[PDB]
Amino acid sequence: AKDTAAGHVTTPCTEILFDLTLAKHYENQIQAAESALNRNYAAIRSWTLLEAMSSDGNRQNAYTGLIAYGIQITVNAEQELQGPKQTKLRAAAALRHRAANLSAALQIQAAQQATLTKPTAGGAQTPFSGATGTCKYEGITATAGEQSCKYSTEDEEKINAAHMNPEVMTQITTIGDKYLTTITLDAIAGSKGNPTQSSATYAEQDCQDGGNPGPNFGGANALGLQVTKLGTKATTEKTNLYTAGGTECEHQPGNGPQKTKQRLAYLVCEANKAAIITPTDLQTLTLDALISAPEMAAIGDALLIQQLLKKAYGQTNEQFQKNFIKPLAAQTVKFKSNTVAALMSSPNSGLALAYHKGK
Amino acid sequence: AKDTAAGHVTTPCTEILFDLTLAKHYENQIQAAESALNRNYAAIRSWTLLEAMSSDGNRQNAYTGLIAYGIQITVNAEQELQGPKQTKLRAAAALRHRAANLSAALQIQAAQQATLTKPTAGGAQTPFSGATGTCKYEGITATAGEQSCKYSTEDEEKINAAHMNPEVMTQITTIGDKYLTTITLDAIAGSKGNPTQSSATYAEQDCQDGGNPGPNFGGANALGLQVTKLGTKATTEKTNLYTAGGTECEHQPGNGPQKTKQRLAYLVCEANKAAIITPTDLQTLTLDALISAPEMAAIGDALLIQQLLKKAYGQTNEQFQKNFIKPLAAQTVKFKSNTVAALMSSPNSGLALAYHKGK
Ligand SMILES: *[C@@H]1O[C@H](CO)[C@@H](O[C@@H]2O[C@H](CO)[C@@H](O[C@@H]3O[C@H](CO[C@H]4O[C@H](CO)[C@@H](O)[C@H](O[C@H]5O[C@H](CO)[C@@H](O)[C@H](O)[C@@H]5O)[C@@H]4O)[C@@H](O)[C@H](O[C@H]4O[C@H](CO)[C@@H](O)[C@H](O)[C@@H]4O)[C@@H]3O)[C@H](O)[C@H]2NC(C)=O)[C@H](O)[C@H]1NC(C)=O
Ligand SMILES: *[C@@H]1O[C@H](CO)[C@@H](O[C@@H]2O[C@H](CO)[C@@H](O[C@@H]3O[C@H](CO[C@H]4O[C@H](CO)[C@@H](O)[C@H](O[C@H]5O[C@H](CO)[C@@H](O)[C@H](O)[C@@H]5O)[C@@H]4O)[C@@H](O)[C@H](O[C@H]4O[C@H](CO)[C@@H](O)[C@H](O)[C@@H]4O)[C@@H]3O)[C@H](O)[C@H]2NC(C)=O)[C@H](O)[C@H]1NC(C)=O
Numbered sequence A, B: 001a002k003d004t005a006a007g008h009v010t011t012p013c014t015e016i017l018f019d020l021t022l023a024k025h026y027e028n029q030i031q032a033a034e035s036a037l038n039r040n041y042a043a044i045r046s047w048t049l050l051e052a053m054s055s056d057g058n059r060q061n062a063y064t065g066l067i068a069y070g071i072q073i074t075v076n077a078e079q080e081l082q083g084p085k086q087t088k089l090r091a092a093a094a095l096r097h098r099a100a101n102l103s104a105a106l107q108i109q110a111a112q113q114a115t116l117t118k119p120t121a122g123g124a125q126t127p128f129s130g131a132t133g134t135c136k137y138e139g140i141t142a143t144a145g146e147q148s149c150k151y152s153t154e155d156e157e158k159i160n161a162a163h164m165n166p167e168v169m170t171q172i173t174t175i176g177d178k179y180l181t182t183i184t185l186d187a188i189a190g191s192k193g194n195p196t197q198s199s200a201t202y203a204e205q206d207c208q209d210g211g212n213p214g215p216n217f218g219g220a221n222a223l224g225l226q227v228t229k230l231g232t233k234a235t236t237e238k239t240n241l242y243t244a245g246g247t248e249c250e251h252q253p254g255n256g257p258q259k260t261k262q263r264l265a266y267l268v269c270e271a272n273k274a275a276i277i278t279p280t281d282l283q284t285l286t287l288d289a290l291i292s293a294p295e296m297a298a299i300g301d302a303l304l305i306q307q308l309l310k311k312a313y314g315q316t317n318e319q320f321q322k323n324f325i326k327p328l329a330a331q332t333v334k335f336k337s338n339t340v341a342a343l344m345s346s347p348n349s350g351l352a353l354a355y356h357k358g359k
Helices: A012-053 A057-109 A153-158 A260-273 A287-292 A295-303 A306-313 A317-325 A349-358 B012-053 B057-109 B153-158 B260-273 B287-292 B295-303 B306-313 B317-325 B349-358
Strands: A120-122 A133-143 A171-175 A182-192 A207-211 A219-230 A236-240 B120-122 B133-143 B171-175 B182-192 B207-211 B219-230 B236-240
Touching (some): A012 A057, A057 A260, A057 A295, A057 A317, A057 B057, A057 B349, A133 A219, A182 B219, A287 A317, A295 A306, A306 A317, A349 B057, B012 B153, B012 B349, B057 B295, B287 B306, B295 B306, B306 B317
Antiparallel strands (some): A182 A219, A207 A219, B182 B219
């Protein structure tokens, strides 16, 4: 089923939730990838220490092969991350920017009741040069209390990173531009008798004189207006991410002016297409992943093919784990105390290496 | 002179420029620090290759000392960056969020001319139960063309990262909240004759009947209103970053409700106080910086004090540069071609290390 999340956007608040949720999804993809690289670099420092601490030549070559393998794949994956990272961050910033815009518009569009000021009565005056009575109001205002978006359990279940994988997203839903640009209001004028510049009794926030001025045009002559409501209705719009053929982004820029929804759909499409490749996690490497890794052929040939690799790293995963993986979190190093991996990510990392390479 | 940049904020557009400029300043501080770390890690990979390519034991120890020194300071500086990074990013996100808000409010507050709709005439009706004539308008709107902020040369010279060092910043200036929450308008009603529900000639966007209805209340009886302008005036406000004593952030959260300006001032204060420590640039290391570096005492003692260091790295900077710095960009490595530093940041980094450690 496609477009579960976008198909749940029906209001300004759910567009805000979609936009923020998708931005956080892209941000989290980058953070996860960068965490995988940092873990790999921490593994490389750990093996560097173990390589300096081993006396056996072939075991030293074994660690060196893990160092070389790790450097190759992690440097490559870090370089490869840069394009997708920038593409995804471009979309996340724009989505956050849109959600801010919409939240600000929502607060203003909630200002739906006017407070009248005290008017001033006149005769003919611009823009009613032909009137015999005018009632002029300055500084009518409308303000709402602080608005907040409330989400139900299902809003948060449907508009969710779990439904934002690229394979299920074909469109975005946005609030129409009028909500962000247009003030709307209703107003009504009322007249009774012969209102003039002498209609200067203002106690009812209108212009009255004659008889007994009072509530509900109590007086003989009365003129007034009210702004009886404000607020522009939100509408929704759909925008496709892809061309009709399905591969290419719709709404590429540079082809003429675009609306906000079109610019957002383009950025979302590109961010969806910019898949991240995460390299192997070195800290949980298995024997089979190592010897079947394509980079290990030339590395093992340089240092020692798959028969040679097993000869270096173990015939089973159990002994590979014991010799090359478990020491990272379990082997203690003390000199003048910490486990290998934490030590080589600590303030004493360099000093532990110098101490053991010199000893 | 303090507060050059904030003292130049006098309008919504210059607050937007300040907020975006400061966010980019914090972002650039993080990027610069991370670039310095990446350069250092690239130096460490380069020395790792040279250490594998050297035949002399003491020259191998020399490279190892540079590796150990680089790992220590760069891992430490990377760990130390994390708190300040998050503090600065918190402020940059909030400043961008505010600038978005303000730009959206600016577009709405620019909608200063109303378009009247065709009214409907009535007699007495809510909210004028006492009127004999009413003229009711639904869906009056106000919309502006697309707004943009224009900056002068001096706006960009004063509101500039060059004036945003922590030592010169004591306050921020923000637009008052009413600009973001309140619609303001002027309106006027006009009456002539005896307008009633029969005043149903609407050609002038008012209610007329009798005689010859026409422009300027041409008819005998007329009722109408106009919204003659809209728009809320921007005002500015100052908020101090520090308490009266000058050390501590003012506007710490958790002490009661806060306004937007207070939350922003707190984040800006904390981001200003969260100074980043950048480590030595390994790729341009001098001899004197190396031997005077505090970490090199224990490292050199472990591998080889300052007399020992000169013995290992050179008596002059010229020979230190030749032996340990210049080979990074100048020494070519070829096997089955690239300079050392680029090779060890390339897809063949790991393989170059394996090849030379095995040879
Ligand atoms: C969040 O909400 C904010 C607030 O509304 C949005 O911010 C607005 O974003 C739009 C789109 O990015 C901005 O419009 C752009 O404005 C720039 C600059 O325009 C000014 O400077 C130009 C020279 O630098 C000048 O040519 C312009 O003057 C022309 O245009 C005006 C208006 O049409 C016209 O009156 C003039 O006579 C000129 O003809 C102007 O002075 C402009 O460069 C951009 O142009 C590109 O895009 C449009 C639309 O695709 C296209 O027509 C062009 O051909 C060109 O390709 C564009 O107009 C706007 O200024 C922002 N408003 C504010 C207050 O900041 C923001 O987009 C929202 N974000 C999200 C993610 O939702
Ligand atoms: C950009 O512009 C946007 C749009 O205006 C700004 O977004 C607004 O930000 C403010 C401040 O962060 C948001 O207000 C917060 O709202 C949350 C959630 O409130 C709702 O949920 C609560 C439970 O989760 C509930 O208690 C709330 O109900 C109470 O409050 C309302 C309103 O006062 C009242 O009517 C109720 O009866 C209850 O008494 C509500 O349903 C809330 O948790 C926050 O409270 C903290 O902060 C306030 C002020 O410091 C303080 O009073 C509290 O004691 C508490 O410490 C806060 O109210 C607001 O919802 C956002 N609006 C929208 C549309 O998103 C944004 O801040 C701008 N950014 C920048 C950087 O300029």
